[PDB]
Amino acid sequence: HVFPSFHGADVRKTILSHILESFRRKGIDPFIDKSIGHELKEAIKGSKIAIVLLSKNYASSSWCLDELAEIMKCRELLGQIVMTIFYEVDPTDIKKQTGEFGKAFTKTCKGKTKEYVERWRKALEDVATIAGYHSHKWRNEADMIEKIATDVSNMLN
Amino acid sequence: KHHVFPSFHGADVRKTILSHILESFRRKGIDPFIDNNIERSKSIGHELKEAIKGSKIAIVLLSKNYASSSWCLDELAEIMKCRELLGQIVMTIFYEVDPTDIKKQTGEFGKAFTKTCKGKTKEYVERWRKALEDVATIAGYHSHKWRNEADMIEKIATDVSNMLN
Amino acid sequence: KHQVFPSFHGADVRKTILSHILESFRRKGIDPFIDNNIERSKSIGHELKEAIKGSKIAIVLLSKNYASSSWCLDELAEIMKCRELLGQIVMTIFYEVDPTDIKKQTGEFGKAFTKTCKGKTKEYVERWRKALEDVATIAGYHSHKWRNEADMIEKIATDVSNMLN
Amino acid sequence: QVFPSFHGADVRKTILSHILESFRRKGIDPFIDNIGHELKEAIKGSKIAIVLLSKNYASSSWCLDELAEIMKCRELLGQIVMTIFYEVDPTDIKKQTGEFGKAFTKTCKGKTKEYVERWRKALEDVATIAGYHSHKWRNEADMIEKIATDVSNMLN
Ligand SMILES: Nc1ncnc2c1ncn2[C@@H]1O[C@H](COP(=O)(O)OP(=O)(O)OC[C@H]2O[C@@H](O)[C@H](O)[C@@H]2O)[C@@H](O)[C@H]1O
Ligand SMILES: Nc1ncnc2c1ncn2[C@@H]1O[C@H](COP(=O)(O)OP(=O)(O)OC[C@H]2O[C@@H](O)[C@H](O)[C@@H]2O)[C@@H](O)[C@H]1O
C-alpha cells in the first residue's frame, strides 16, 4: 500500500510511532525496512502511495535524499501518489534549501558530484510544492495524524 | 501504446539501414513508431516521450554522430528511465561505432558529444553521459562484425518478433 | 522444467549458498544436476562433460577461489563452448567478487588464477583466460548489491523457471 | 512464538535471512526489533528464544544483555532456549576464547566487573544447551530445515 520515507533519528520514536498506530487501526500496511539498494528501489516502485515525512535533518542523510529522487521518479512514470508531511520545517525552506534544513543539505553536498547534487536539489524543489500537511498549521498532532490516516485510507480505495 | 520505438540519428541512417529495418518489421507484422506520422500541430518532444512510455521494446540505433543531436540523447535518457521503472526491453545496434567508444565518449564519437554539451548545465550533460555509460553495456548487434547487412536485419527482426511476448 | 548444470567452487559455496540455491530449485520443480550423485566407479570428468552437454541452462557461481581449481575452469571452458555451438543459456552469479576482477584476471581472484597456471602449457592458460573474459561480460547477479540473500535466491530461482518456458 | 537474538553484521544478510524464510514457510512468526525494557517485555513474552551465536556476537554488549535476559527467563519462566553455533565452536563460547573471546575481553575493557561476570555465566551456561553446530552439518539448507521443524514441533 504505502512506503514511508523518513529520517528515523528525527521522528522514529515520536510522530512516526503514532502514525504507524493510526495506519494499523485503519488496516493500512506500511512498508518499513547514498546507498539505497535494488531491493529498496523495488519496494518503492511497488507502492501505490509514498509518504514523505520531511524534518529538520532529513537532508543530512543522502539515503533519505536518494529515496526522494526515486519517489518523484515514480510519481512521473508510474501513477505513484506522493503525500507530504512537513514536521517542524517550513515548506519554503525545503523548496529553497534554507534555514537549518539547508545547512544540513549543503553538508550532505560537500564532496559530491555536481550531478548528484542537482538531482536531489530538483527533487526537493518539486516535493515542496506537493500539497500536504504542515504541523505548524495544525491544531494538535493527534488530529493531524487522524486526518492523514483517513485521507490515505480513502485514496487506497 | 506502441509496439516498438526506434531511437536513431536520421542523418546517419534514416534513408538507408533504418528504412530496411522498418521494411523487415512491416513484413513480419511488427508495428514500429514512425515519427513522420506525428499529427502536425503537435509538440514533437511530448509525442516522443509518450511514444517511449508505450513501447514494449526500444531499439537504440547507435551511430557515430548519434550524440551530435540532443534529440537523440534526450530520447536515450528517457528510454533508460523506462527500462528501469517499466519493463521496457532495450535492444542495441552499434552501426559503425565501437561500444566502449560510446561508454567513455572518446574517439570520434566523443568529440561529437562534448560539442553538444556547450551551453548545458553539467547536470543535464551527465544525465546524457550515464545514459551512454549504461546503454553501452547492453549486449547488442555490431554491424562491423557482419558480412551482409540484409541478413543482419533478418536476424534483428526475428529477435524482436520472438521477444514480443 | 529440469536440466540445469551448476558450476561452483565447493569450498567457497557448497555447504552454504549453493545448498540454498538447490533447495529453491526443487521447491519450484527444477531438477538440477548433482555431482554427488555420479555413480561410483565412474570417471568424474567424463560424467561432467556429458552433464554439461545435456543441460539447457548453466549457472556459473563465481567466487574468489573459483580459479584456484582447474575443475572449475575446465567446466567453465566447456560451458562457453556449449553456449556457442549448442543453445545453452549461461547465467552468472558473482558471489562476493567483482566482474572486472574476473575480466582483468586480477584482484585476489587473479592471484588464485595465476598459481593454477604454473606448470601448464600456454594453451591451457588462455583457453581458461578467454573463458573468464567471456563469462565476465554476461549480465548476471552481483551478491554485494543484495542485502537479503534469501530474496536473491528467490529471484534467481524464478528467473530460471521463466527461462525454462 | 520465537525471539531471535543475533549480531546483525554477522548473519543478517546470510543465514538469518534463510532462517526467517524457513519460519514464514512454516507459519512461525518471529519478533524483529526494527539495554531495553520494551525489548525485555518481548523476551519475557516469547515462548522460544533462538540464540544465533557468531564470532562477533560478544563484540556488542547489546547482544550480551539479551543473552543474560534469555537465561534469566529460562530459569524463572518456562522459556525454551535453542542454540545455533554459527562458525564458532561451543567450547570457545564456554571458555570465551578464540576470536569470540578476544571480542569479549574488548567489550569488557572499561566495563563494570559486575556486568562482566553475569555475561560470563550466561555464555558458560548457554554453551551447554544442546543445539545446532554449523561445522557438523552437511549443508546449511538441511540444518535450517531441521531447526525450523524442531521449533515448529515444540510450538505445539
Ligand atoms: N517541426 C520540426 N522540427 C524539427 N525538425 C523537423 C520538424 N518537421 C520536420 N523536421 C525534420 O526533421 C529533421 C531532423 O531529423 P533527423 O536529423 O533524422 O533527426 P535527429 O536529430 O537525428 O533525431 C531525431 C529523433 O527523432 C526521433 O523520432 C528519433 O528517435 C530520433 O531520436 C530536420 O532537419 C527536419 O528536416
Ligand atoms: N574421486 C573422488 N571420489 C570421491 N570424492 C572425491 C573424488 N575426487 C574428489 N572428491 C571430493 O571432492 C572434494 C572437492 O570438491 P570441491 O571442494 O567442490 O572441489 P572444486 O575444485 O571446487 O570442484 C568443483 C566442481 O565440481 C563440479 O561438480 C562443479 O561444476 C565444479 O566445477 C574433495 O575434498 C573430495 O572430498
D30 touches chain C (CB under 8 A): no
Q: What is the amino acid identity at position A120?
A: W
Q: What is the amino acid identity at position A32?
A: I
Cβ of C69 less than 6 Å from ligand 2: yes
B57 alpha-carbon distance from chain centroid? 11
Q: Using N-to-C axis directions, what is the helix angle for A62-77 and A114-127, rounded to 10°?
A: 60
C26/C57 Cα distance (integer angstroms): 15
Question: Edge-to-edge strand order for the sheet containing C57-62?
Answer: C4-7, C57-62, C89-94, C141-142
C46/D41 Cα distance (integer angstroms): 60
Provide the grid cell at C57: 541452462
Is D107 in a helix, a strand, or coil? Answer: helix
Segment 107-146 of chain C within 8 Å of chain B by CB: 137, 139
C23 touches chain D (CB under 8 A): yes
Residues of A carrying an active site annotation: 67
Cβ of B10 less than 6 Å from ligand 1: yes
- Residue with the nearest Cα to atom 15 of ligand 1? B10
Residues B95-133 as b/e (b if ≥16 CB within 10 A, e otherwise) read bebbbebbbebeeebeebbeebbeeeeebbbbbbbebbe
Instruction: Assign 3-class secondary structure to chain B.
Output: CEEEEEECCHHHHHHHHHHHHHHHHHHCCCCECCHHHCCCCCCHHHHHHHHHHCEEEEEEEEECCHHHCHHHHHHHHHHHHHHHHCCCEEEEEEECCCHHHHHCCCHHHHHHHHHCCCCCCHHHHHHHHHHHHHHCCCCCEEHHHCCCHHHHHHHHHHHHHHHCC
* Interchain contact, C151 vs A39, CB within 8 Å: yes
D87 annotated active-site: no
Q: CB–CB of C52/C98 below 8 Å? A: no
Is D104 in a helix, a strand, or coil? Answer: helix
Q: Which atom of ligand 2 lies nearest, measured to the CA of C10?
A: 18
CA angle D93, D95, D97 (to 5 degrees): 75
Provide the grid cell at B72: 537523440
Nearest ligand to the CA atom of B116: 1
Domain count, chain D: 1
Closest CA to C31 of C60, C3, C10: C3
Cβ of C124 less than 6 Å from ligand 2: no
* Interchain contact, D140 vs C22, CB within 8 Å: no
Is D30 in a helix, a strand, or coil? Answer: strand
Tell me the shortest Cα–Cα distance from D27 to chain C, in angstroms.
Answer: 17
CA angle B52, B53, B57 (to 5 degrees): 60
D145/C81 Cα distance (integer angstroms): 38
C34/C4 Cα distance (integer angstroms): 10
**Which residues lie below 8 Å from residue B99, measured CB to CB, with a gap of 6+?**
B136, B137, B142
Q: Give distance in angstroms: CA of C101 to centre of ligand 2.
A: 24
Q: What DSSP element (H or E) covers C125?
A: helix C122-135
Q: Identify all chain A residues contacting B85, using CB atoms and an 8 Å cutoff.
A: 45, 73-74, 77-78
Cβ of B95 less than 6 Å from ligand 1: no
**A116 is in which domain, residue-wise?**
1-157
Question: Edge-to-edge strand order for the sheet containing A81-86?
Answer: A2-5, A49-54, A81-86, A133-134
**Which residues lie below 8 Å from residue C94, measured CB to CB, with a gap of 6+?**
C62, C102, C140, C141, C142, C143, C144
Angstrom CA distances, B19 to B62, B101, C94, C132, D105, stand at 15, 26, 41, 39, 75
Resolution (A): 2.5
Q: What is the amino acid identity at position C8?
A: F
Q: Can you point out the beta strands (E) in D46-94?
A: 48-53, 80-85
Instruction: Write down the experimental method used for this entry.
Output: X-ray
**Which residues lie below 8 Å from residue C101, measured CB to CB, with a gap of 6+?**
C107, C108, C109, C110
In the block, cell 525489548 appears at D39
Nearest ligand to the CA atom of B112: 1
